[PDB]
Design a protein around this ligand. Sequence first.
Ligand SMILES: [Cl-]
Ligand SMILES: [O]
Ligand SMILES: [Zn+2]
Ligand SMILES: [Zn+2]
Length: 219
Amino acid sequence: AYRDQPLGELALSIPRASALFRKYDMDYAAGGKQTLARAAARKELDVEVIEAELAKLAEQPIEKDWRSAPLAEIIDHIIVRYHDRHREQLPELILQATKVERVHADKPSVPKGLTKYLTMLHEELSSHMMKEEQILFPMIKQGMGSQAMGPISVMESEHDEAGELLEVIKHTTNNVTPPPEACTTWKAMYNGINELIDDLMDHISLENNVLFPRALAGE
Ligand SMILES: [Cl-]
Ligand SMILES: [O]
Ligand SMILES: [Zn+2]
Ligand SMILES: [Zn+2]
């Protein structure tokens, strides 16, 4: 009964479901409590077809399941797999976008504003991740997860803001689709943007859907 399940649980229980939800622009990361039914209905999508596709993915080799993993292990995974990679990814994308916007300034397809939006994302995500690393993650490791309502509500609000920047980035780049006349830098940059989006949604999903609720529950 997949349509009646929350998007968060689906993304965390079925491998490559994340990419499927990315394809349909369903926010399993910050909107992970919403049922598939409501998500699909809002987008005028055929939920039976989506239920079928999830079933196909569900037959595949059962991946690493973070839902019951120890919180300290989730934390260490986040820091290394996501926070450190974002800190490397964003500066590079910023350089590339600066070049693309300059070199192709005359083209109507140029993603005007992209450098600015990536710069904002980098600045905001950097300060956010530092707060997590300095206070929230240590407090959870030190058994104070049940006391983290304050920081968690702020971090979740900031996750929603990161989502809004991702939407603006997607809009500016025609849903990260390079035009016919794009060359190697522009195409490679769009591949990097898709990778950043994929990673950031999975990162936010792991925080919002696993780490934060389990921490508050005293696990
Ligand atoms: Cl190019
Ligand atoms: O984060
Ligand atoms: Zn984080
Ligand atoms: Zn976060």
